[PDB]
Design an enzyme around this catalytic site. Sequence first.
Site, mmCIF file in Angstrom:
data_model
loop_
_atom_site.group_PDB
_atom_site.id
_atom_site.type_symbol
_atom_site.label_atom_id
_atom_site.label_comp_id
_atom_site.label_asym_id
_atom_site.label_seq_id
_atom_site.Cartn_x
_atom_site.Cartn_y
_atom_site.Cartn_z
ATOM 1 N N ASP A 1 -5.186 11.883 8.940
ATOM 2 C CA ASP A 1 -5.239 13.131 9.709
ATOM 3 C C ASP A 1 -5.391 12.930 11.216
ATOM 4 O O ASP A 1 -4.709 13.635 11.966
ATOM 5 C CB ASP A 1 -6.375 14.005 9.187
ATOM 6 C CG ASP A 1 -6.073 14.743 7.904
ATOM 7 O OD1 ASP A 1 -4.993 14.636 7.355
ATOM 8 O OD2 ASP A 1 -7.098 15.410 7.504
ATOM 9 N N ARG B 1 7.316 -2.968 16.833
ATOM 10 C CA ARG B 1 7.875 -2.205 15.721
ATOM 11 C C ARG B 1 6.983 -0.997 15.478
ATOM 12 O O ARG B 1 5.781 -1.173 15.287
ATOM 13 C CB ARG B 1 7.998 -3.073 14.462
ATOM 14 C CG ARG B 1 8.350 -2.240 13.222
ATOM 15 C CD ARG B 1 8.750 -3.203 12.095
ATOM 16 N NE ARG B 1 8.980 -2.402 10.902
ATOM 17 C CZ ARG B 1 8.267 -2.401 9.790
ATOM 18 N NH1 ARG B 1 7.288 -3.262 9.576
ATOM 19 N NH2 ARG B 1 8.618 -1.482 8.896
ATOM 20 N N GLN C 1 9.914 -1.805 3.272
ATOM 21 C CA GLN C 1 9.659 -2.474 2.002
ATOM 22 C C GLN C 1 10.239 -1.755 0.802
ATOM 23 O O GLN C 1 9.523 -1.038 0.068
ATOM 24 C CB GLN C 1 8.154 -2.632 1.794
ATOM 25 C CG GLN C 1 7.486 -3.401 2.922
ATOM 26 C CD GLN C 1 6.053 -3.779 2.651
ATOM 27 O OE1 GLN C 1 5.444 -4.500 3.462
ATOM 28 N NE2 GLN C 1 5.379 -3.340 1.587
ATOM 29 N N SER D 1 8.277 -1.272 -2.591
ATOM 30 C CA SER D 1 7.016 -0.577 -2.707
ATOM 31 C C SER D 1 6.995 0.833 -3.219
ATOM 32 O O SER D 1 6.185 1.094 -4.129
ATOM 33 C CB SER D 1 6.281 -0.599 -1.345
ATOM 34 O OG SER D 1 6.154 -1.947 -0.855
ATOM 35 N N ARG E 1 7.566 -12.163 -0.860
ATOM 36 C CA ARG E 1 6.507 -13.027 -1.333
ATOM 37 C C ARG E 1 7.246 -14.311 -1.762
ATOM 38 O O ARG E 1 8.422 -14.217 -2.086
ATOM 39 C CB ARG E 1 5.772 -12.497 -2.559
ATOM 40 C CG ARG E 1 4.988 -11.210 -2.277
ATOM 41 C CD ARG E 1 4.389 -10.679 -3.602
ATOM 42 N NE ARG E 1 3.813 -9.368 -3.334
ATOM 43 C CZ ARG E 1 3.448 -8.501 -4.255
ATOM 44 N NH1 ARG E 1 3.505 -8.875 -5.529
ATOM 45 N NH2 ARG E 1 3.053 -7.255 -3.964
ATOM 46 N N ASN F 1 9.067 -8.657 5.818
ATOM 47 C CA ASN F 1 7.615 -8.632 5.887
ATOM 48 C C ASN F 1 7.131 -9.768 4.981
ATOM 49 O O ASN F 1 7.655 -9.932 3.871
ATOM 50 C CB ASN F 1 7.070 -7.313 5.339
ATOM 51 C CG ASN F 1 7.375 -6.136 6.260
ATOM 52 O OD1 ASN F 1 7.959 -6.295 7.330
ATOM 53 N ND2 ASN F 1 6.948 -4.940 5.842
ATOM 54 N N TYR G 1 3.334 -11.577 3.561
ATOM 55 C CA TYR G 1 1.902 -11.719 3.604
ATOM 56 C C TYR G 1 1.373 -12.823 2.683
ATOM 57 O O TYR G 1 0.456 -13.523 3.139
ATOM 58 C CB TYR G 1 1.238 -10.407 3.166
ATOM 59 C CG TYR G 1 1.423 -9.283 4.179
ATOM 60 C CD1 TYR G 1 2.510 -8.417 4.156
ATOM 61 C CD2 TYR G 1 0.474 -9.153 5.170
ATOM 62 C CE1 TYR G 1 2.631 -7.402 5.097
ATOM 63 C CE2 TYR G 1 0.608 -8.137 6.096
ATOM 64 C CZ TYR G 1 1.667 -7.290 6.082
ATOM 65 O OH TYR G 1 1.717 -6.255 6.989
ATOM 66 N N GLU H 1 6.549 -7.857 9.684
ATOM 67 C CA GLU H 1 5.132 -7.730 9.463
ATOM 68 C C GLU H 1 4.581 -9.093 8.991
ATOM 69 O O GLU H 1 5.242 -9.708 8.166
ATOM 70 C CB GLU H 1 4.665 -6.718 8.384
ATOM 71 C CG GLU H 1 5.076 -5.297 8.672
ATOM 72 C CD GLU H 1 4.646 -4.253 7.736
ATOM 73 O OE1 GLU H 1 3.671 -4.569 6.955
ATOM 74 O OE2 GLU H 1 5.131 -3.123 7.596
ATOM 75 N N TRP I 1 1.353 -7.713 12.036
ATOM 76 C CA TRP I 1 0.750 -6.488 11.533
ATOM 77 C C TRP I 1 -0.683 -6.646 12.070
ATOM 78 O O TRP I 1 -1.310 -7.569 11.496
ATOM 79 C CB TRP I 1 0.866 -6.238 10.051
ATOM 80 C CG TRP I 1 0.333 -4.870 9.709
ATOM 81 C CD1 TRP I 1 -0.917 -4.572 9.222
ATOM 82 C CD2 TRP I 1 1.022 -3.646 9.906
ATOM 83 N NE1 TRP I 1 -1.019 -3.219 9.093
ATOM 84 C CE2 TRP I 1 0.141 -2.617 9.467
ATOM 85 C CE3 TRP I 1 2.315 -3.312 10.324
ATOM 86 C CZ2 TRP I 1 0.528 -1.273 9.488
ATOM 87 C CZ3 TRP I 1 2.689 -1.963 10.351
ATOM 88 C CH2 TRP I 1 1.771 -0.986 9.952
HETATM 89 O O1 LIG Z 1 -1.377 -3.961 4.102
HETATM 90 C C1 LIG Z 1 -0.890 -4.310 5.446
HETATM 91 C C2 LIG Z 1 0.362 -3.597 5.844
HETATM 92 N N1 LIG Z 1 1.368 -4.059 4.918
HETATM 93 C C3 LIG Z 1 2.628 -3.497 4.829
HETATM 94 N N2 LIG Z 1 3.278 -4.031 3.785
HETATM 95 O O2 LIG Z 1 2.925 -5.156 3.180
HETATM 96 C C4 LIG Z 1 2.941 -2.030 5.092
HETATM 97 O O3 LIG Z 1 4.346 -2.045 5.408
HETATM 98 C C5 LIG Z 1 1.913 -1.666 6.145
HETATM 99 O O4 LIG Z 1 2.130 -0.264 6.237
HETATM 100 C C6 LIG Z 1 0.473 -1.997 5.639
HETATM 101 O O5 LIG Z 1 -0.501 -1.461 6.531
HETATM 102 O O1 LIG Z 2 2.832 -8.807 -0.645
HETATM 103 C C1 LIG Z 2 2.702 -7.833 -0.342
HETATM 104 O O2 LIG Z 2 1.939 -7.648 0.858
HETATM 105 C C2 LIG Z 2 1.690 -6.303 1.154
HETATM 106 C C3 LIG Z 2 0.192 -5.980 1.442
HETATM 107 O O3 LIG Z 2 -0.522 -6.081 0.212
HETATM 108 C C4 LIG Z 2 -0.556 -6.794 2.501
HETATM 109 O O4 LIG Z 2 -1.914 -6.294 2.636
HETATM 110 C C5 LIG Z 2 2.487 -5.377 0.166
HETATM 111 O O5 LIG Z 2 2.596 -4.003 0.615
HETATM 112 C C6 LIG Z 2 3.066 -6.272 -0.796
HETATM 113 O O6 LIG Z 2 3.753 -5.840 -1.731
HETATM 114 ZN ZN LIG Z 3 -6.597 16.813 6.079
#
Ligand SMILES: OC[C@H]1N/C(=N\O)[C@H](O)[C@@H](O)[C@@H]1O
Ligand SMILES: O=C1O[C@H]([C@@H](O)CO)C(O)=C1O
Ligand SMILES: [Zn+2]
EC number: 3.2.1.147
Lengths: 499, 499
Positions: free
Chosen positions: B68, B93, B185, B188, B257, B326, B328, B407, B455
């Site tokens: 919000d 980005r 992504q 997702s 991944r 992206n 992580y 990211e 990120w």
């Molecule tokens: O979890 C970290 C970050 N990870 C992301 N994907 O892995 C999302 O695109 C972003 O919106 C989210 O804040």
């Molecule tokens: O591997 C992944 O990384 C991110 C996130 O979990 C990072 O905090 C996500 O949206 C996945 O599917």
């Molecule tokens: Zn609200």
Amino acid sequence: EITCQENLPFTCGNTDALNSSSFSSDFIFGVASSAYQIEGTIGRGLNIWDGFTHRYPNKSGPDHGNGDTTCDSFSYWQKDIDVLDELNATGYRFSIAWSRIIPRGKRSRGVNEKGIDYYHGLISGLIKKGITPFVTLFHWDLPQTLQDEYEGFLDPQIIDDFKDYADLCFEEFGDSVKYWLTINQLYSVPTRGYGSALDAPGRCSPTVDPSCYAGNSSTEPYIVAHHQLLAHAKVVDLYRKNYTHQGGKIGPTMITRWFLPYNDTDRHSIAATERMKEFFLGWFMGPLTNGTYPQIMIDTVGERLPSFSPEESNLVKGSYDFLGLNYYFTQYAQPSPNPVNSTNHTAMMDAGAKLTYINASGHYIGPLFEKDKADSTDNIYYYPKGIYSVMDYFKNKYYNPLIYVTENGISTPGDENRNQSMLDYTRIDYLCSHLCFLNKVIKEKDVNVKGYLAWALGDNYEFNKGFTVRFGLSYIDWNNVTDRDLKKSGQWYQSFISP
Amino acid sequence: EITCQENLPFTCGNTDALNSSSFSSDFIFGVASSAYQIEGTIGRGLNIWDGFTHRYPNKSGPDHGNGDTTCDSFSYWQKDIDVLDELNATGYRFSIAWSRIIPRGKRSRGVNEKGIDYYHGLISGLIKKGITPFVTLFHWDLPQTLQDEYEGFLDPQIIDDFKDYADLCFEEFGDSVKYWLTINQLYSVPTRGYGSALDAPGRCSPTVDPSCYAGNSSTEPYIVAHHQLLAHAKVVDLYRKNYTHQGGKIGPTMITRWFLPYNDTDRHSIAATERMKEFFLGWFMGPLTNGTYPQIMIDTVGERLPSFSPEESNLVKGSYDFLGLNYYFTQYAQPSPNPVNSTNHTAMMDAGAKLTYINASGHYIGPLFEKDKADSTDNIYYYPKGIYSVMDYFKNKYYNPLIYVTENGISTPGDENRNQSMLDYTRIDYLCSHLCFLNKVIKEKDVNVKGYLAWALGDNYEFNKGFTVRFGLSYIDWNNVTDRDLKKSGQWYQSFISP
Ligand SMILES: OC[C@H]1N/C(=N\O)[C@H](O)[C@@H](O)[C@@H]1O
Ligand SMILES: O=C1O[C@H]([C@@H](O)CO)C(O)=C1O
Ligand SMILES: [Zn+2]
Ligand SMILES: *C1O[C@H](CO)[C@@H](O)[C@H](O)[C@H]1NC(C)=O
Ligand SMILES: *C1O[C@H](CO)[C@@H](O)[C@H](O)[C@H]1NC(C)=O
Ligand SMILES: *[C@@H]1O[C@H](CO)[C@@H](O)[C@H](O)[C@H]1NC(C)=O
Ligand SMILES: *[C@@H]1O[C@H](CO)[C@@H](O)[C@H](O)[C@H]1NC(C)=O
Ligand SMILES: *[C@@H]1O[C@H](CO)[C@@H](O)[C@H](O)[C@H]1NC(C)=O
Ligand SMILES: *[C@@H]1O[C@H](CO)[C@@H](O)[C@H](O)[C@H]1NC(C)=O
Ligand SMILES: OC[C@H]1N/C(=N\O)[C@H](O)[C@@H](O)[C@@H]1O
Ligand SMILES: O=C1O[C@H]([C@@H](O)CO)C(O)=C1O
């Protein structure tokens, strides 16, 4: 002979002099609420009050407060019932959130069974404690999808979507609910939602308020009011043709005010006062009792006032079994210009009247009703006799209707601390002074008033004010909303009901 | 020869050993954000992240936090630019909130000129400081109206509505924006939004999560993924046919991944790991590079996997100028049953793999990535070499694409106090260990990686976690969000960029 006070100090808080036994034995006494204001968003779709308060936070209230969690009556509905039981209330007005039972707006998109269950449990619990529900189908919280599809009540598509929603409510709840309200305060959405943009959805002409996303304050209030009347009337026809077996009654809710001349020996002020009655009350009551708008509106508003076809006129005329009349205050009226060609013209200017709480000789109409700290000349003052005047007028002008007073109440500031908030003697004075006049008008004028529901059961989100004011007869701590504790006013009301 | 560390302690935080000069001179370095997470609802319509977080507050985060107000980048966009300028970043980005520029979803219903102006000012300010914008058109925040009209990406109607939205963005911003991302992504929303219902819109099969309002976890993820690919491809075709004069590039965003076998001498685990690559990456990369889903998915998913027509296959195949990857973390894969007849079947079970961070001999893959206090066996661990493995795989399997890492980052707990939060040495270790491997894979494998966006720019609302974790390279005080103060990681990153 009944004598009622109009000015401080009041002595009607003494239940030896005024109590429920002063009224007919079947008279209903209770309190009222609305869904956006008390439930929270948990378990429902989004509506235009969510949309408006989030898109225009400074319009939600000075604190930017909204109905996201509020007093959490979604979780604590039983505590609301417990307040009513403590009061020995015989009525409770609440509203159904359209977005809770049909989150997608249009019924063919599916219903939320859990939402339906929430209202079944509330209804069952009220009935189990001997409380008669008075249920408002639409207390302004239109599903946001409908506003985004076709701008809600601006478009005639609203009629069938509202009809299908109402049908679902009658089907699911009408075996237990015998008093239905269609639309809360017909005057308000057209003027505040589409005229001044103080309320959702927040449409207006560009120079009225540059923040409005779209609109036209001169024409849209009339379109919306027209569609509200048609939607209301289609729902009443549906109820009376398909749900007569339920043995209940349905009506609209009007916001009422009385109007007095700013100068009672000035013909121009006197004319402005009568125009106010037609433009404020007659805008809706003309169609509801005659199938046509008042002649002064026809004449003034001209091509901006929609026409009813013969079929529509017949649907709207007589489309009520009773009227829910909300009453809070009265205004003085004086003449004011109506600049129809101005880019900032609004429908509210069509009445040709300026409204005040002080008359030409400097008399304030009554006790303080609402302080406006940014501009104290904009403070609101109340007028207990106005409820007598309004009821008498409805009886005489509008064919002796059956009436329930569906809201009456007063706020106290959110800056007060808990102790001050609980010692709400100003609320006892307001409530008792109005109830004295209500008893007096029933006895003297034989107005067919059969119940009274005070605004509000508990502290809640107040439209336009956030949590900066409190209206409850029970107190809610915003740091921990579970409890609803009867204030002095709630304690008084309990004694008034069971003296 | 480049040597990179895989385990604590890391020594890559020393900018004498690793800095931007380690990479090609044109390489872009910056940070990333998304609109729901940073802007606030002021000035926009409502979207399904507003809807989901308000209807299902315990899914929004453990604190019930939502977007919000968040860090109020609507008001403080200039402070975001100031962080980027302090970093000497060359890229940023961000995403455009569809509900800010077309609150009613469908472009023919009108645009919000003030919303368009907000993004013009941001874009202009970035360019004025030499920062290249990378703009995501859709970072999950679908206008709620579209979800309520036709369930959003579940229906083929999304394709034209998304195309018209994208067209507006290209028309208004494409003279200045030269790098566009379509959908954030791809994996997702189908899986979390329509499979497990962890994310908006929150659909699933009844026995997966009884709170879901509707859904089918076994079929809906495939439908939504299919419509995402078609919508993406229609937008890329629109961009390349009608906006070629702008001289920019467009692509999708993939979540990547790496996968390693839970037991690297067990053929069943090795098979599960290769199935994971196809089901996680190939689900989207097969269509994007060949116009067809992977054969293993065709075989396993059967009648639940939609087909592309020849026209659709041709539209989707090659529908990118680059890929935003992206990255992580990496998981170990072992076999798991796929009970397609179970009422709680999900599309995610079709891969026939169970994913862990610990292998069969007890080895944790790398340092802690995310602690899960409710169940510590569910903690996530990271694996710096995974970014090397992913990039190498994309080059070799997916036709040597142009890639931008869109990211990469790590959270720290929201329970830490400000001082602890600012001393985010765990974030320097994560970032530097990944950048070391990224330089190594560019040099050793010649992967065409041209930029890296960490990120996040600042602390924000984290999807599913509220404000209970922080991902920013700059700190935001939730009691007063104006400032964005560089943490130790931001200070390190500044020195890495300008050593
Ligand atoms: O979890 C970290 C970050 N990870 C992301 N994907 O892995 C999302 O695109 C972003 O919106 C989210 O804040
Ligand atoms: O591997 C992944 O990384 C991110 C996130 O979990 C990072 O905090 C996500 O949206 C996945 O599917
Ligand atoms: Zn609200
Ligand atoms: C409040 O918000 C609106 C934007 O929604 C803005 O136009 C207006 O200036 C603000 N009001 C005040 C009094 O600051
Ligand atoms: C959280 O909310 C959902 C309702 O949206 C409810 O069904 C569920 O039981 C709650 N979860 C927990 C863990 O309490
Ligand atoms: C516009 O209306 C405001 C209030 O309604 C008034 O103060 C102002 O004089 C009006 N302007 C014109 C040009 O009439
Ligand atoms: C809040 O209010 C309820 C009712 O008074 C009480 O039982 C509960 O302990 C309180 N919670 C906290 C955290 O104070
Ligand atoms: C349903 O799935 C849950 C987790 O996916 C699992 O624990 C449970 O055994 C499953 N039940 C059946 C009947 O397969
Ligand atoms: C909050 O933060 C800004 C920037 O540090 C500061 O200038 C402002 O005074 C602060 N506001 C309050 C009320 O502390
Ligand atoms: O302002 C008091 C009260 N007044 C009412 N109308 O006058 C509204 O129907 C109700 O929602 C509002 O809270
Ligand atoms: O007279 C009126 O009373 C109420 C409210 O202002 C009471 O606080 C309202 O909605 C009107 O139009």
